From a paper:
In eukaryotes, integration of sterols into the vacuolar/lysosomal membrane is critically dependent on the Niemann–Pick type C (NPC) system. The system consists of an integral membrane protein, called NCR1 in yeast, and NPC2, a luminal soluble protein that transfers sterols to the N-terminal domain (NTD) of NCR1 before membrane integration. NCR1 and hNPC1 share the same structural fold: an N-terminal domain (NTD), a middle-luminal domain, and a C-terminal domain found on the luminal side of the vacuolar/lysosomal membrane. The current transport model for the NPC system postulates that NPC2 binds sterols in the lumen and loads them into the NTD, which transfers the sterol to a tunnel that is formed by the middle-luminal domain and C-terminal domain of hNPC1 and NCR1, respectively.
Residue numbers in the entry: 20 to 241
The structure:
């Protein structure tokens, strides 16, 4: 029930670097998740991945996803709505069974193992989801001092497109993306073989994942 843009890794771009994913054709179907990879996926991405058997990610990909999400978690953990939206984006990007329909590989290069690895890709993104995602993180204050968390996870982004641009720009060694990820908002409606990323999104004043008024303006008494 899966279609992927990439699956597993095909070597390093340079020494001291990390593994980079292998592009796969659209007709590729991944195997069933191992017991170990499934339990790890539930710990990293939440209980919504329990009954998932086919995923577009291997165990090494889930581990790399875990190590990077844990570095960014303390910056936004005070606001559950932002943390939920933040984790949900990169979890679907890495492992969703429909990853091949909203992620488009645009550039590759050869690794040290002499195999094709991802150099640049596009993520077709629903504007409304990205806008609400930015709205749930923009007002988070970092408990140390009184600066905005958006200065670190978003580089001081003022709108959602600059936010996603900061997340997707290739920033290896700086805990960022190992390759260039471009978020596209102009996917034509005539394209039926592609779709935009879209999911449940949680506002910072949502009842289930409410954030403090110091981190959310709509959570303050009006
Ligand atoms: C998902 O991701 C994939 C992969 O990234 C995307 O696939 C690409 O889609 C585009 C269209 O959306 C395709 O462009 C069309 O390509 C054909 C074939 O192009 C070759 O031959 C023509 C001659 O027939 C050459 O002119 C081309 O060289 C350059 O053309 C233009 C002119 O400047 C330039 O912008 C291109 O970047 C291209 O540069 C490439 O040339 C070298 C030399 O070979 C190449 O090695 C290198 O890759 C350079 O990037 C090219 O050699 C072409 O005929 C079409 O031309 C007509 O279309 C446009 C409108 O679309 C008109 O403006 C134009 O005047 C022509 O009338 C297109 O250029 C592209 O090939 C394709 N990539 C593939 C198949 O690998 C998907 O689009 C993505 N899906 C999304 C976003 O939904
Ligand atoms: C979130 O906030 C960001 C930051 O403000 C914002 O990004 C900016 O968006 C605007 C609008 O899309 C961009 O403005 C365009 O800029 C290009 C060139 O930009 C370069 O140079 C600046 C210099 O500071 C750099 O910062 C930037 O990164 C780029 O390197 C211009 O060419 C554009 O002018 C055309 O605009 C229209 C589109 O074509 C035309 O109608 C218009 O007539 C202009 O045409 C001219 O250019 C054509 C192309 O060459 C040419 O054919 C024509 O003859 C004519 O000369 C436009 O001004 C701006 O660059 C973005 N900046 C950054 C840093 O991203 C986001 O839009 C915002 N997002 C949301 C959702 O709110
Ligand atoms: C990007 O994300 C957006 C937010 O999730 C997406 O917007 C959603 O788009 C769908 C499809 O266009 C809408 O569903 C339609 O809603 C209308 C209106 O429904 C209301 O009115 C009718 C009576 O007129 C009533 O019967 C309903 O119960 C509602 O009260 C319906 O008429 C349609 O049949 C269809 O259900 C969503 O409502 C809309 N949601 C939001 C929050 O805007 C957008 O589609 C996404 N774009 C892409 C390209 O993925
Ligand atoms: C807080 C700052 C540093 C911003 C940029 C956050 C970055 C993290 C959370 C995000 C940005 C891009 C994401 C990312 C890019 C691409 C891949 C390759 C894939 O095969 C495994 C997931 C992985 C490795 C993920 C992990 C999480 C990353 C690295
Ligand atoms: Zn590996
Ligand atoms: Zn989800
Ligand atoms: Zn859109
Ligand atoms: Zn580019
Ligand atoms: Zn098409």
């Amino acid at each position: 029930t899966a279609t992927c843009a990439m699956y597993g890794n095909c070597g390093k771009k340079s020494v001291f670097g990390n593994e980079l994913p292998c592009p796969v054709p659209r007709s590729f179907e991944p195997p069933v998740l191992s017991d170990e990879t499934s339990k790890l996926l539930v710990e990293v991405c939440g209980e919504e991945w329990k009954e998932v058997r086919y995923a577009c990610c291997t165990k090494d990909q889930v581990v790399a996803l875990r190590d990077n999400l844990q570095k960014a978690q303390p910056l936004i953990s005070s606001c559950p709505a932002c943390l939920k939206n933040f984790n949900n984006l990169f979890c679907h990007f890495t492992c969703a069974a429909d990853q091949g329909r909203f992620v488009n590989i645009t550039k590759v290069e050869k690794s040290k193992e002499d195999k094709d690895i991802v150099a640049e890709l596009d993520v077709f993104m629903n504007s409304s989801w990205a806008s609400e995602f930015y709205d749930s993180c923009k007002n988070i204050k970092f408990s140390a001092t009184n600066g905005y968390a958006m200065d670190l996870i978003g580089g001081g982004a003022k709108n959602y497109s600059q936010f996603l641009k900061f997340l997707g720009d290739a920033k290896p060694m700086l805990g960022g993306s190992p390759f260039q990820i471009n978020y596209k908002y102009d996917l034509a409606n005539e394209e039926k073989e592609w779709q935009e990323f879209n999911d449940e999104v949680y506002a910072c004043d949502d009842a289930q994942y409410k954030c403090a008024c110091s981190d959310c303006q709509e959570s303050c008494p009006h």
